[PDB]
Amino acid sequence: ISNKQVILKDYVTGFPKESDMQLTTATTKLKLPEGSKGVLVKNLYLSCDPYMRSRMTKREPGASDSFDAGSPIVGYGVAKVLESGDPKFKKGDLIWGMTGWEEYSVITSTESLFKIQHIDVPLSYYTGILGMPGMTAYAGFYEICNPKKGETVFVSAASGAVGQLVGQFAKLLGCYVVGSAGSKEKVDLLKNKFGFDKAFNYKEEPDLDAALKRYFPEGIDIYFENVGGKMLDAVLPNMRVHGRIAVCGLISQYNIDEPEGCRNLMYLIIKQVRMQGFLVFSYYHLYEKFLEMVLPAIKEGKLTYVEDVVEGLESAPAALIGLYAGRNVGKQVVVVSRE
């Protein structure tokens, strides 16, 4: 059987490019290696997730590991089990978890796979609102931000799958919610589709302080931080006393053209702010509680979701670079196969 793959050809130094990846056609006989405790899966959907930017660069165990040069890109996806060496997984099971950028993957361990039971929702949702990004938004907002009705909330990269959901959880709690994004289309989505109280295009603002003051004349209780860089420095002087910064991502910091260093940390003292990082990995004990909350809200239309749908593994490199460059609109999915 042909097995198309997206190979990382070269460890990345500059801003990633399409040619750092190589489309190739391997072969497979769709047989799990002897003694495998893992699964052999047909990949259906693949996520482009901002965090993947950081895995393009060669390091030792010093971030939250790098990709392997000469091997497929790996990331979260949705797949169908063909063969299993783990008796808890069966042929025909739909799963989500870390898989290869290929038509067929051996996933050597199953400990970090979820069996999808609710299929009355698009399967692609388990790469976004019902997968790692949705869980990240739930953990960061409820477990880190200590939110209260009436608090003011600012979300950077607000049109991404994390930010989309943070903002909606904040609106449902009765917070005042503003987002930043990089185009008018994304600003309009945030206001119209996701019910944010306000939003602005940071690429068009000559002074981020003045922009934040337009929307938060008495400051920000909660900053859900996905970007870092100049937005973090602009936010810090606008925090309220006992404000909180949930540090989810600092994506701008992989851009060599982004200002390096945060200069406004004195506001942590002045405004007695808690600035706290977290990893979703530490919160998957909450995943079943999270599904209990989010699945009925999706079916009822109380929560909504925007994905950027890319057709076929051949379009995956361009989609992934587009995400890195901010050229996508909402959560980037790749349709490898519909079934």
Side-chain angles (χ1 to χ4, degrees), residues 141-160:
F141 187 59
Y142 294 117
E143 303 304 308
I144 311 292
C145 291
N146 188 17
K148 181 180 171 175
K149 169 184 44 163
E151 284 183 337
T152 66
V153 178
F154 182 54
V155 182
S156 59
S159 67

Side-chain angles (χ1 to χ4, degrees), residues 39-42 79-84 89-95 113:
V39 285
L40 164 71
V41 303
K42 179 174 193 189
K80 181 180 164 285
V81 172
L82 306 180
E83 302 283 347
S84 182
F89 288 93
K90 296 186 142 194
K91 175 172 197 294
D93 284 346
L94 292 167
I95 60 179
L113 304 179

Side-chain angles (χ1 to χ4, degrees), residues 43-305:
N43 296 127
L44 305 180
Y45 302 88
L46 299 168
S47 195
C48 301
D49 297 320
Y51 82 89
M52 287 169 75
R53 169 69 181 279
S54 59
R55 299 187 76 178
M56 237 88 157
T57 285
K58 172 67 172 75
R59 314 185 191 81
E60 226 111 287
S64 37
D65 289 0
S66 64
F67 298 137
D68 303 301
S71 293
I73 297 285
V74 291
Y76 288 107
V78 171
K80 181 180 164 285
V81 172
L82 306 180
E83 302 283 347
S84 182
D86 177 349
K88 46 169 316 194
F89 288 93
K90 296 186 142 194
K91 175 172 197 294
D93 284 346
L94 292 167
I95 60 179
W96 75 266
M98 192 70 75
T99 195
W101 281 28
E102 57 190 338
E103 294 181 82
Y104 302 97
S105 296
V106 170
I107 305 178
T108 64
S109 166
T110 183
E111 271 47 70
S112 292
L113 304 179
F114 182 78
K115 205 184 285 193
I116 293 158
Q117 269 159 244
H118 300 75
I119 67 113
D120 59 339
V121 72
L123 287 179
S124 59
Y125 281 29
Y126 290 93
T127 65
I129 184 167
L130 297 172
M132 172 282 285
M135 190 65 238
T136 301
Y138 177 99
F141 187 59
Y142 294 117
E143 303 304 308
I144 311 292
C145 291
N146 188 17
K148 181 180 171 175
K149 169 184 44 163
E151 284 183 337
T152 66
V153 178
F154 182 54
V155 182
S156 59
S159 67
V162 177
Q164 286 170 31
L165 196 62
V166 173
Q168 292 175 268
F169 284 153
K171 280 308 294 169
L172 287 168
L173 198 68
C175 302
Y176 170 82
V177 189
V178 180
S180 60
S183 72
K184 169 170 174 53
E185 180 177 26
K186 284 171 192 156
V187 165
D188 289 350
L189 198 61
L190 287 167
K191 300 177 80 164
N192 295 318
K193 176 71 167 167
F194 292 109
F196 279 55
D197 291 275
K198 183 51 68 7
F200 71 85
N201 176 357
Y202 70 90
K203 293 183 172 187
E204 288 310 328
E205 295 292 338
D207 182 68
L208 289 174
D209 185 73
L212 290 171
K213 278 184 167 63
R214 295 201 305 272
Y215 304 110
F216 296 104
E218 297 197 308
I220 298 164
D221 288 303
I222 295 165
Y223 177 35
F224 196 98
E225 171 62 295
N226 290 134
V227 303
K230 65 176 41 165
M231 191 61 77
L232 175 60
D233 261 345
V235 167
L236 275 158
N238 290 287
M239 297 298 302
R240 292 170 55 76
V241 64
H242 304 307
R244 293 128 283 153
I245 304 174
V247 186
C248 180
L250 298 169
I251 202 69
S252 74
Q253 289 203 341
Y254 305 117
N255 294 333
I256 67 177
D257 304 324
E258 177 76 29
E260 208 38 67
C262 172
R263 301 179 58 175
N264 285 326
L265 287 177
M266 193 70 78
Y267 287 92
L268 296 183
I269 301 174
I270 295 163
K271 305 296 184 165
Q272 308 196 248
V273 167
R274 175 168 60 84
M275 181 170 101
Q276 180 171 345
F278 71 98
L279 287 169
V280 65
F281 309 135
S282 292
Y283 295 93
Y284 283 119
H285 53 106
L286 305 178
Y287 183 70
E288 292 286 356
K289 186 195 284 170
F290 161 77
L291 291 177
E292 279 178 43
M293 185 196 72
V294 171
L295 273 173
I298 295 164
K299 283 172 209 173
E300 282 173 291
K302 293 221 170 95
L303 288 175
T304 192
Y305 174 64

